[PDB]
């Protein structure tokens, strides 16, 4: 076992092996943006796909081009916890190598007239953190990945358009990744039509006279050939036998001087076998057969050179004289069956009104640029670049592929441009489908949505800078000059930057991370939005959408989403799911081969997974592999049923493969009602991380990989043995062999003590282990703000007892003892931010300076010299933070206050007071204050203060740094000088810089000592080099805003406690409100006098169905009193052997469950610390969907000797009589969510007033008032309260005189109204005037 | 004509295109510094500041 697991192991009850450990859980960000940046040679990705394809640019002469080399990305200038700090993009410049090769016009490619090679900068480009996210202008951003329409080809078809007709109408569209879309389709009377950029609809043929196809090509290309034999006698017509499916004989069919079918009945399968057989080649047509058919090309007059008969019109009788008298012999018509081939691209031909080429270019030219009056150079550009030019479109190698899927074709590749042979494939396969073969697609299907990550979405925006850039590029290169332009000159930074600046601050599925918790971030940076730039709209989505769909098993959570407005939208990723190279989601599977389940994993998308039959993970498996129940529970072509156990091809990996990472982390999912289970998963993310962190008695297992994997812990790089634990730093040197050859060995990890995060809660960290104490790569070294010993905890288990208490527990209402508000156990540290900015005004620079008008010693005594707090000042709200007072000008005052400052001889001071306070009703504790000032402006007392000290600070810190490194290696060279050459008296009496120049025997000895020289050399250079970087980093100025002096921010830090109105929840989507905080002696007591911290409703859990926290509090009360057992064994100081004993047979109790733990070969300390670490109750491991049975939870609670009803017999605090028939209590863990009611609780008697409307509305301190909405005054009106309404029409809202007039009444105890006319009226009066419309007011 | 033609639209677009009017030669200072800054920004690889912006323009900080 691990060091961090031998210390506290989970027991677990799952039962199905697990086979592939849960990936890296935010591999889709890191993969995504790493391809973004890291050079690709060969098949284009990021940015050497942008630049490869902006670049070359040939200027629009030919003269000159502009050439693309290479790219590098440069240093950060500052690392991301400096960004943090200065409030900056924590980004990296690039740098592209680029050339301008300048031609000589007279000789024919004198290439050599100008090279010019330069590097030139553009644009900045953030850069991805180690955990998934962008320091975006000093606060955490995440880009949430996108599930877009994939390009390609969709043939869609809807139904009942046309309700009336009742029939099924098609549609073809074909949507490039950038590029115009082009959509087919037909009418209720059959006739295709195209509609390029959804224009007007076009006669669909029309298309194709733009691509060079003549009448008699485009059916050649459509239809079928009949031919007629004019054989010297009445129309003999070559039969193709298959041709006669389900018809109807109008005319009897004879040859070789039999009858086959008789006229006037349906022409039979049977008849058709027998033509074939018979080999009939030519039957004798009627003449009046041919009155119907239409001819295939245009036949002319060969006797004398003239036209007969164009090509597409229907023959009769006097068409077919001409047609044999003129010589033809042989005759070409259409094969427009009603069933299996329509007259589609006839019917449209004959209503298309072109007739050649440009005819139809100018159409589309009409339709594209109505009114513009066209040319043949405008339209032929236009309708060229449409589709055929690989700069105004792009389908991309995902359309390229997903066009050649809906087309059979066997090429995966191909290119970007539309082709003659896709529109034709496309029409053909929009007619098959029209005719009956083939289906339509869904556009729902996940192998038809596709993954659009952070690095190409950055790759796409950073394309369209450089297409912003490559227009004037192109401008400069035409006309500028040659000889005297560099690369540099012409390149401009602002476009590029200004492009991928707008998108990782501004877009909108870039944004703040949700930092209210370890998952909470690990879930954001896995979510999956369909908005944004090519997505949906939460008001025009449809339904079809949002509904789960039987791909997204494997793929997509069918339980975690926001039950709002945004209900399907947005979704998270599966646990195991991962993303093909095309984007398309994907799912792991074990291979099954000859009935055995193999061991080997492959990962099948949503089409290759249809068409196999993959088994479930609750089937049971024996020792060979081979299934045990013959008939395995499968799933096909997405449905389910029952199948051999030979005719399965793949199983599921595990049985939480279907779920996201935070429905997996609730126990007992499988006993809940989906809908509970989704408001669980929902608010399991808003916990607050309370003051000190308590594992789950109950969890999943999958604790311990969502806190590893969120990087809110510090793991350890590499193993070693603890050299120094700090509460802020955790120094560990490392092994021998893990180390490697020219450094010290020592990691040093310095834990990010109180610190706010997006949402004011505090991420802090902990070290929980223990000096000179071994680890290995891997182990947590330091808890993060709410994690346990590694494993996530986002709340406390506590007493729940099942039963009403005297209506404190009313409709979701929590009743909460009094021992869990003494124990601050549920108090969470709320640091908050608020700053004072000096800003340079008309009347003058503002200061910050202690002196502070109208204001005494009182308040002034916790302020510094400066007029800056001190740090740990506790205020509270209007305390003064900083004193700022700025310049102020004449007072127009009344002749009353005029006489009263002459009386007293007090004229008041020409500087007005606006010092930052503290907000009201808020308290707290500075706990830190910084300073940023101009560059340029002289720095206060207290700025030189801080940064002396941050300057010292720093200094020690890296004098420690390398003090710690140079001691190990100093280490290092005694422990290879002991080998070649032990030196006692004259070896160690030198000090440690005695090795230099000195020498001994040559062996690795000398050679690391002379490697250790250079170091020293180096080492030096780099001490006092980069110190004297970070001091001229610490003492260097700040780009503040212009117009900005210097900028003050003060750090308070709140510590709230529980109270009425705080939501607390559970994991089961069992919220509520906090009622009561009940004396301890109250609460319903057990027989053993001990109390219940929380008591719950029994009415919630019903109609709710969330029966898991039923169970989970069974398991819950066993675990705990395994625990207590424990306790009892340490506590009466028993030996090791019957701790071990106990123990180890609360390990293995379950029916057959995977885990097996052996204490024999635990060290009896590792067995005192292990016990240690369950005396507060046995952790236990429910996995999602392979639980603990309700046969394992009695076994538990007979183990503990507890009731194995789990329900035992309360007597009521107050009168001390028993509670009538037995209640079930046991430990439910419960969450304390962000609905804090100080936040949520606000008045308002009068404040701020909006400018225009003239009516309430503040926020800053005082927010604005309740608005009182339309409904609300449907109410008043129909209660009949006409004096309510007015006067919160009038005087409460808009009348300005009425509003102060009153405000006066109240004041001199007379409660009556004078309103008068609300501004919005007459506002909306003066802006209805100003459409030149007479509105007025008809006065008496 | 172009010379003309290039005055009268680049002095309009100046006199308005502005909701606060800036006169005119303060355009011209202001565009001025756009180039500058856009100079020195390629040859440094960061934003000048307005001392050395100040040094190269010609004109006090």
């Known amino acids: 076992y691990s060091y961090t697991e031998k210390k506290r192991i989970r027991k677990d009850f799952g039962k199905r092996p697990q086979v592939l450990d849960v990936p890296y859980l935010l591999s889709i960000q890191l993969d995504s943006f790493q391809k973004f940046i890291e050079q690709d040679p060969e098949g284009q990705y990021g940015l050497e796909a942008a630049f490869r394809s902006v670049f070359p640019i040939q200027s629009y002469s030919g003269n000159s081009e502009l050439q693309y080399v290479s790219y590098r990305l440069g240093e950060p200038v ?410 540099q000159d012409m390149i401009n930074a602002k476009p590029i930057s200004a492009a991928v600046k707008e998108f990782f601050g501004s877009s909108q599925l870039s944004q703040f991370m949700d930092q209210n918790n370890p998952l909470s971030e690990i879930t954001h940076k896995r979510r999956i939005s369909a908005l944004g730039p090519g997505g949906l709209t939460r008001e025009r989505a449809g339904f079809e959408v949002r509904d789960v769909h039987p791909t997204h098993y494997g793929r997509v959570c069918p339980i975690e989403t926001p039950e709002g407005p945004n209900i399907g939208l947005i979704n998270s990723l599966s646990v195991y799911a991962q993303t093909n190279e095309y984007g398309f989601l994907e799912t792991p599977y074990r291979k099954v081969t000859d009935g055995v389940v193999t061991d080997e994993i492959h990962y099948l998308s949503a089409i290759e997974e249809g068409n196999y039959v993959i088994a479930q993970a609750n089937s049971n498996l024996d020792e060979e592999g081979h299934f045990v129940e013959d008939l395995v529970t499968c799933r096909s072509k997405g449905e389910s049923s029952l199948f051999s156990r030979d005719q399965v091809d793949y199983m599921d990996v595990s049985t939480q493969q279907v779920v996201s990472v935070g429905a997996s982390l609730i126990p007992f999912l499988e006993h809940d009602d989906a809908n509970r289970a989704l408001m669980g998963a929902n608010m399991q993310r808003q916990a607050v991380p309370t003051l000190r962190a308590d594992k789950p008695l109950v969890g999943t297992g999958m604790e311990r990989a969502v806190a590893v994997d969120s990087g809110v812990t510090a793991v350890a790089k590499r193993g070693g043995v603890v050299q120094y634990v700090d509460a802020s730093r955790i120094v560990i040197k490392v092994n021998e062999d893990e180390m490697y050859p020219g450094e010290a060995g020592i990691d040093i990890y310095n834990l990010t003590k109180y610190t706010r995060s997006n949402q004011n809660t505090c991420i802090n960290q902990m070290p929980c282990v223990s000096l000179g104490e071994p680890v ?161 402006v002289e720095k206060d007392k207290r700025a030189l203060e801080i940064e002396e000290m941050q300057l010292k600070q720093a200094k020690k810190d890296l004098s420690e740094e390398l003090q710690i490194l140079e001691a190990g290696l100093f280490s290092r060279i005694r422990a290879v000088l002991v080998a070649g050459g032990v030196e006692a008296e004259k070896l160690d009496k030198l000090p440690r810089d005695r090795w230099l120049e000195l020498g001994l025997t040559d062996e690795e000895k000398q050679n690391q000592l002379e490697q250790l020289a250079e170091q020293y050399d180096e080492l030096k250079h780099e001490f006092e080099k980069k110190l004297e970087a970070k001091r ?163 076994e538990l609670l007979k183990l503990g000797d507890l009731p194995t009803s789990g329900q035992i017999r309360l007597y009521d605090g107050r009168t001390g009589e028993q509670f009538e028939r037995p209640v079930t209590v046991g430990y439910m863990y419960m969450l304390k969510l962000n609905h804090l009611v100080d936040d949520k609780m606000h008045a308002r008697s009068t404040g701020s007033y909006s400018l225009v409307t003239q009516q309430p509305l503040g926020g800053k301190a005082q927010f604005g008032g309740q608005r009182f909405g339309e409904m609300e005054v449907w109410a008043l009106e129909a209660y009949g309260a006409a004096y309510t309404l007015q006067e919160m029409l009038t005087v409460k809202s808009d009348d300005v005189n009425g509003r102060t007039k009153m405000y006066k009444n109240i004041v001199d105890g007379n409660h009556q109204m004078e309103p008068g006319m609300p501004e919005s009226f007459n506002v909306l009066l003066k802006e209805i005037r100003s459409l030149g419309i007479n509105i007025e007011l008809e006065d008496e | 004509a172009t010379w003309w033609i290039r005055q009268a639209i680049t002095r309009s677009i100046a006199d308005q295109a502005r909701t606060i009017r800036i006169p005119v030669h303060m355009i011209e200072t202001i565009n001025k510094l756009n180039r500058i800054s856009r100079q020195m920004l390629q040859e440094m690889g960061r934003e000048p500041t307005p001392e050395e912006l100040a040094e190269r323009m010609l004109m006090p900080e």
């Open chain 1, 776 to 936: 290995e790569r891997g182990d947590v070294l330091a808890d993060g703000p709410s994690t346990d010993l590694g494993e996530l905890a986002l709340g406390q288990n506590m007493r729940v007892a099942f039963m009403p208490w005297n209506g404190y527990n009313f409709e979701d209402s929590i009743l909460v003892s009094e021992r869990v508000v003494q124990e601050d156990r549920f108090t969470t540290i709320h640091i908050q931010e608020l700053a004072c900015v000096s800003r340079d005004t008309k009347l003058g620079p503002e200061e910050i300076t202690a002196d502070i008008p109208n204001v005494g010693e009182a308040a002034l005594s916790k302020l510094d010299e400066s007029g800056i707090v001190y740090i740990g000042a506790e205020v509270t709200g209007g305390d003064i933070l900083v004193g700022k007072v700025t310049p102020k000008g004449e007072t127009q005052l009344t002749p009353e206050e005029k006489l009263l400052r002459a009386i007293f001889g007090e004229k008041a001071s020409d500087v007005k007071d606006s010092s930052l306070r503290v907000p009201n009703g808020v308290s707290g504790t500075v706990i830190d204050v910084q300073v940023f000032t101009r560059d340029g």
């Open chain 1, 1032 to 1194: 001229r980093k610490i003492t260097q100025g700040d780009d503040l805003a212009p117009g900005v002096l210097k900028i003050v921010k003060v750090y308070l830090a709140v510590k709230r406690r529980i109270q009425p109105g705080d939501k607390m929840a559970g994991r089961h989507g069992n919220k509520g409100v906090i009622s009561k905080i009940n004396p301890i002696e109250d609460m319903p007591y057990d027989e053993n006098g001990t109390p219940v911290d929380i008591v719950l409703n029994p009415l919630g859990v019903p109609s709710r169905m969330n029966i898991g926290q039923i169970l989970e509090t069974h398991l819950g009360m066993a675990a705990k009193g395994i625990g207590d057992k424990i306790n009892a064994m340490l506590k009466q100081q028993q030996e090791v052997a019957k701790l071990r004993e106990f123990i180890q047979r609360a390990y293995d109790l379950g029916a057959d469950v995977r885990q097996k733990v052996d204490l024999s070969t635990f060290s009896d300390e590792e067995v005192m610390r292990l016990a240690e670490n369950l005396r507060k109750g046995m952790p236990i491991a429910t996995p999602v969907f392979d639980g603990a049975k309700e046969a394992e939870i009695k």
């Open chain 1, 78 to 487: 500052f690392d991301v916890q400096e960004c943090q700090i200065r409030g900056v993009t924590y980004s990296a410049p690039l740098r592209v190598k680029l050339r301008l090769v300048i031609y000589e016009r007279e000789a024919p490619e004198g290439t050599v007239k100008d090279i010019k090679e330069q590097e030139v900068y553009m644009g900045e480009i953030p850069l991805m953190t180690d955990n998934g996210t962008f320091v975006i202008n000093g606060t955490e951003r995440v880009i949430v990945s996108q599930l877009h329409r994939s390009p390609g080809v969709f043939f869609d078809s809807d139904k009942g358009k046309t309700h009336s007709s009742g029939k099924v109408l098609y549609n073809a569209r074909i949507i490039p990744y950038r590029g115009s879309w082009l959509d087919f389709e037909f009418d209720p009377k059959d006739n295709l039509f195209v509609r390029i950029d959804r224009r007007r609809k076009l006669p669909a043929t029309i298309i194709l006279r733009a691509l060079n196809y003549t009448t008699e090509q485009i059916l050649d290309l459509f239809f079928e050939k009949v031919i007629f034999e004019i054989r010297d006698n009445k129309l003999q017509m070559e039969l193709v036998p298959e041709r006669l499916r389900g018809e109807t004989a109008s005319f009897d069919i004879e040859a070789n001087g039999k009858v086959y079918v008789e006229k006037g009945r349906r022409i039979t399968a049977r008849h058709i076998r027998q033509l074939e057989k018979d080999d009939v080649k030519l039957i004798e047509v009627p003449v009046e057969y041919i009155a119907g058919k239409v001819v295939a090309k245009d036949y002319i007059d060969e006797s004398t050179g003239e036209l007969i008969c164009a090509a597409n019109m229907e023959l009769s009788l006097d068409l077919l004289a001409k047609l044999s008298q003129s010589g033809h012999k042989r005759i070409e018509t259409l094969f427009t069956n009603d069933l299996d081939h329509g007259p589609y691209i006839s019917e449209t031909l004959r209503v298309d009104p072109t007739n050649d080429r440009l005819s139809a270019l100018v159409e589309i030219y009409r339709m594209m640029r109505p009114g513009e009056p066209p040319t043949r150079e405008a339209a032929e550009s236009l309708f060229e670049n449409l589709f055929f030019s690989e700069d105004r479109y792009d389908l991309s190698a995902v359309g390229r592929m997903k066009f050649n899927r809906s087309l059979l074709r066997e090429e995966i590749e191909g290119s970007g441009i539309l082709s003659k042979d896709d529109i034709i494939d496309v029409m053909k396969k929009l007619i098959d489908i029209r005719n009956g073969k083939g289906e339509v697609d869904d556009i729902d299907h996940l192998g038809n949505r596709r993954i659009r990550s952070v690095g190409e979405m950055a790759e796409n925006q950073f394309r369209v800078g450089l297409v912003r850039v490559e227009r004037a590029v192109k401008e400069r290169l035409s006309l500028g000059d040659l000889d005297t332009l560099m690369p």
